[PDB]
Amino acid sequence: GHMNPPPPETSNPNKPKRQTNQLQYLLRVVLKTLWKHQFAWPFQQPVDAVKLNLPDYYKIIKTPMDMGTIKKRLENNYYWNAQECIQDFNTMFTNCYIYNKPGDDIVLMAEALEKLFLQKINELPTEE
Ligand SMILES: Cc1noc(C)c1-c1cc(C(N)=O)c2c3ccc(C(C)(C)O)cc3n(Cc3ccccc3)c2c1
């Protein structure tokens, strides 16, 4: 534990909003494809350090990120540029690699998800 921090902010009415084909793709294709993956479930919500009894998790990870937060930030037009969203997915994978040991089952899961993420990002449509 001892306590989990509050989840990352997903909405801000002060931030200007815009819909772009790249942001639409990140939600409709990238997030959706990663969400349905067999290894997605531990990445769908913040790390529950209390349930897992990991008091050092939020001592090590100061920038937590999960797909449920990315989903809500996309639905709330929290990102202005697609690069901000791509960065949150990169933070999510990086936190897993920093916290856990290489070869751990959770790391192998994050790696398969990252492989699928990078394939979809290679297919990111040109800005319209
Ligand atoms: C991702 C990620 N990166 O580092 C950490 C640590 C996580 C992370 C995040 C979460 C979470 N979102 O709470 C869970 C989680 C939730 C519930 C359960 C139970 C067995 C109780 O069902 C087990 C869980 N494990 C452990 C785990 C280990 C190996 C394979 C799959 C899961 C997690 C690992």
From Swiss-Prot:
Subunit structure: Interacts with p53/TP53; the interaction is direct. Interacts (via CTD region) with CDK9 and CCNT1, acting as an associated component of P-TEFb complex. Interacts with RELA (when acetylated at 'Lys-310'). Interacts (via NET domain) with NSD3, CHD4, BICRA and ATAD5. The interaction with BICRA bridges BRD4 to the GBAF complex. Interacts (via NET domain) with JMJD6 (via JmjC and N-terminal domains); the interaction is stronger in presence of ssRNA and recruits JMJD6 on distal enhancers. Interacts with NSD3. Interacts with NIPBL.
Site of covalent link Glycyl lysine isopeptide (Lys-Gly) (interchain with G-Cter in SUMO2): K59
Tissue expr: Ubiquitously expressed.
Post-translational modification: Phosphorylation by CK2 disrupt the intramolecular binding between the bromo domain 2 and the NPS region and promotes binding between the NPS and the BID regions, leading to activate the protein and promote binding to acetylated histones. In absence of phosphorylation, BRD4 does not localize to p53/TP53 target gene promoters, phosphorylation promoting recruitment to p53/TP53 target promoters.
Subcellular location(s) per record: Nucleus; Chromosome
Section covered of the full-length record: 44 to 168 of 1362
Transmembrane segments: none
Sites marked Acetylated histone binding: N100
Associated pathology: Cornelia de Lange syndrome 6: A form of Cornelia de Lange syndrome, a clinically heterogeneous developmental disorder associated with malformations affecting multiple systems. It is characterized by facial dysmorphisms, abnormal hands and feet, growth delay, cognitive retardation, hirsutism, gastroesophageal dysfunction and cardiac, ophthalmologic and genitourinary anomalies. CDLS6 inheritance is autosomal dominant. A chromosomal aberration involving BRD4 is found in a rare, aggressive, and lethal carcinoma arising in midline organs of young people. Translocation t(15;19)(q14;p13) with NUTM1 which produces a BRD4-NUTM1 fusion protein.
Family designation: Belongs to the BET family.
Purpose: Chromatin reader protein that recognizes and binds acetylated histones and plays a key role in transmission of epigenetic memory across cell divisions and transcription regulation. Remains associated with acetylated chromatin throughout the entire cell cycle and provides epigenetic memory for postmitotic G1 gene transcription by preserving acetylated chromatin status and maintaining high-order chromatin structure. During interphase, plays a key role in regulating the transcription of signal-inducible genes by associating with the P-TEFb complex and recruiting it to promoters.
Protein's name according to its UniProt entry: Bromodomain-containing protein 4
Free-text domain note: The NET domain mediates interaction with a number of chromatin proteins involved in transcription regulation (NSD3, JMJD6, CHD4, GLTSCR1 and ATAD5).
Species of the source: Homo sapiens
Other facts: JQ1, a thieno-triazolo-1,4-diazepine derivative, and I-BET, a benzodiazepine derivative, have been tested on tumors with success. Treatment with GSK1210151A (I-BET151, a I-BET derivative) has strong effets on mixed lineage leukemia and promotes myeloid differentiation and leukemia stem-cell depletion.
Domain Bromo intervals: 18-124
